[PDB]
């Protein structure tokens, strides 16, 4: 980074009088170069102040001849941040964090987690669960099932007309789900007030028994089997995570968990707070360890980069059987001379550590959080951070600010206790009145919040708690601000924060089943299924 003398020459303008706001930049830059013995975060904060001082100058002297050179100096400040990030690394705490909240963990998740355990014996493993809220998945499934049947019964037109606009079904069902969900939220809020000793699963159990005639015995057995299964698999209770419970994200977590039944969004909120407070690597349960690099390097690749990677895992699982019931689809359809060439390489190996690589000693900048990428951009299915990294704080604050914007318009609309259509119009009108060029795309996606997970083609979660919040935090870092909305960073900027593909196998069978999202073809296939059950009088 240029020193004071170099900036003085760069920003020299013929016949320009010296300004206090200019000398303040020079003084601050000189102070930066005397900070050799400060922490990386202190140096970033000084660069941040230098950028703010440069902006003050430009805003105060809008027609100054200095501004062209000062805008170039601002570019140099960004480059210095990346230098700081790349040249001062510290050990990443050896923790693997998974999250399974809102119901019983299933065996396929355990089997994936166990692969990480088996090749990372020097890592601690946490599976965060919520001991108060094992019944949320059951509640959501029960309400939605009943709303489906109510919706089909409500129709005063012929359902199995082959040209039936099934979007009529999803629109009506949303009106009914919203009413049922509103009823539960009001019941929960009232019960919490009347008896603060009740936990979520107490209230859900009573609600399900009174409203949907569920058996309390079966719910208690479910909770006990869920607790026993999670605590035999490295479970760690969110309800003992005091830093999380006491911060400004806990109420957002419970908003998603209890009011919206969005376990994916709740897990989005929890994972980055877990990372910030403990350090290590967060993983979705459908991720697998990186494959040993030299394993299949003698086999030449015939389809695409993702397809080759997928058949690598399928080969491993066919001939080593680490995960039972793992698919062979994309492997079982290859040429034999290479298919048997896979079997041949694997026969030469006997230990899992010659198949999967280990994470080992990792290091990263105290400024950063590293994130996984796929073909569509950043994706928070894998994250790496030292404890209390600067970016992990920027990400937490991005989510909290996006929820503040959401709730400022959402909560008044809901307070009027109107129906779904009326609530939505009030909410969207309130959101649109705060939209501008900087936040317009974000505000447009926020308007679909109440539809999340009950309606096709809704992308709100990604903009609220998911990858857009990460991109915005990286922009906060590189632009010395907070509150970024519209993203100007290009892929090259974001790739400064990538997790190396050598450290994670993302093209797993479970991952593919998890990115077949609420399409229009999915909505039609679901409606066909609901019709079939309806015309046999089943749910």
């Amino acid at each position: 980074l240029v020193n004071r003398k170099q900036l003085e020459k760069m920003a020299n303008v013929r016949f320009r009088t010296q300004e206090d706001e200019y000398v303040a930049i020079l003084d601050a830059l000189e102070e930066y170069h005397n900070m050799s013995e400060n922490t990386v975060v202190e140096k970033y904060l000084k660069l941040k102040d230098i950028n703010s001082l440069t902006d003050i100058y430009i805003d105060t002297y809008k027609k100054s001849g200095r501004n062209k050179a000062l805008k170039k100096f601002k570019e140099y400040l960004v480059t210095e941040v990346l230098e700081l990030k790349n040249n001062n690394l510290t050990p990443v705490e050896k923790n693997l964090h998974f999250v399974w909240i809102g119901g019983q963990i299933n065996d396929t998740a355990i089997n994936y987690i166990n692969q990480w355990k088996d090749v990372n014996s020097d890592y601690n493993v946490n599976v965060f669960y919520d001991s108060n809220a094992f019944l949320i998945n059951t509640l959501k499934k029960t309400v939605v099932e009943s709303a489906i049947n109510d919706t089909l019964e409500s129709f005063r037109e012929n359902l199995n007309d082959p040209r039936f606009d099934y979007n009529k079904f999803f629109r009506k069902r949303m009106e009914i789900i919203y009413d049922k969900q509103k009823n539960f939220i009001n019941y929960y809020k009232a019960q919490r007030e009347e008896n603060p000793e009740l936990i979520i699963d107490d209230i859900v159990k009573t609600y399900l028994s009174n409203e949907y005639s569920k058996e309390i015995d079966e719910l208690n057995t479910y909770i006990e089997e869920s607790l026993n299964k999670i605590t035999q698999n490295s479970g760690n209770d969110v309800r003992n995570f005091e830093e999380f419970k006491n911060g400004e994200s806990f109420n957002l977590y419970e908003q998603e968990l209890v009011e919206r039944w969005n376990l994916a969004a709740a897990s989005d909120i929890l994972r980055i707070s877990a990372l910030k407070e403990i350090g290590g690597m967060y993983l979705d349960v459908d991720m697998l360890p990186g494959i040993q690099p030299d394993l299949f390097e003698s086999i030449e690749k015939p389809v695409t980069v993702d397809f080759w990677e997928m058949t690598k895992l399928e080969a491993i699982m066919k001939y080593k059987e680490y995960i039972p019931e793992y698919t062979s689809e994309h492997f079982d359809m290859l040429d034999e001379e290479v298919q048997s060439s896979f079997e041949s390489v694997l026969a030469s190996k006997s230990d899992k550590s010659e198949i999967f690589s280990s994470l080992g000693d990792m290091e990263a900048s105290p400024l950063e959080v590293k994130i996984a990428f796929n073909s569509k951009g950043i994706i928070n299915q894998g994250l790496i951070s030292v404890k209390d990294s600067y970016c992990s704080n920027l990400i937490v604050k991005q989510i909290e600010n996006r929820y503040k914007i959401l709730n400022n318009s959402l909560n008044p609309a809901i307070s009027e206790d109107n129906d779904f259509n009326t609530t939505t119009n009030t909410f969207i009108d309130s959101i649109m009145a705060e939209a501008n060029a900087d936040n317009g795309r974000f505000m447009m996606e926020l308007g679909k919040y109440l539809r999340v997970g009950f309606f096709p083609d809704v992308k709100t979660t990604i903009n609220l708690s998911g990858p857009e919040a990460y991109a915005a935090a990286y922009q906060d870092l590189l632009m010395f601000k907070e509150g970024s909305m519209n993203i100007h960073l290009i892929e090259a900027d974001l790739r400064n924060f990538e997790i190396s593909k050598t450290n994670i196998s993302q093209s797993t069978e479970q991952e593919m089943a998890s990115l077949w999202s609420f399409d229009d073809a999915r909505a039609k296939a679901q409606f066909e299924e609901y019709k079939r059950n309806y015309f046999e009088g089943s749910l």
Binding site: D20, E21, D27
Partner: protein, 216 residues
Amino acid sequence: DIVMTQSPLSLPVTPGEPASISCRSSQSLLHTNGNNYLVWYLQKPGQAPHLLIYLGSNRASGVPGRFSGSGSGTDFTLKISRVEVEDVGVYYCMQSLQTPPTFGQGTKLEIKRTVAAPSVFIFPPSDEQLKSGTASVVCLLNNFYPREAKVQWKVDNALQSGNSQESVTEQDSKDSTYSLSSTLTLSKADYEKHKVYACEVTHQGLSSPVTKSFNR
């Protein structure tokens, strides 16, 4: 114009202790860009003012770290964290928002040191002066603290009045003392009509008055 008002206007401080000077503005010096447009100077005796602080809290390069500025809007403070004896002088605030630039009245910092009694000397008129008709008799009070002191002239034990003038130095930047001259002015004719010329000094540091005298 913007009116700047400082307080206190006289600031006695023990060395090693902190000192604070307040400055208030008749209208806000806070700009929409977020800066406060207030500057501080130190003016040492016989020198031009020297810039200490600009933009409310930016220390000018080269100014010792013990000086800092704070405040916002109409209310500002210059703080010396631990005063040094070289810090004597007059401190001025000034708004840097508009022309005309306007200054506060100035705060004179005084170092509170231990009491020191004057050393007293007396000088008779010289023949080189007397030949043109006037006699100046000079009494010097050297290196004292408390600045307050009293000098009375006696001529053949007769107390004088109306024929003497005093001058006092600024407080020394190293030892924090004052010195004083008192000059008695007579005609040569009057001077040579008397014998004993005495300067009598009273000061807090003197357990009794000290007299210096000579005979013509």
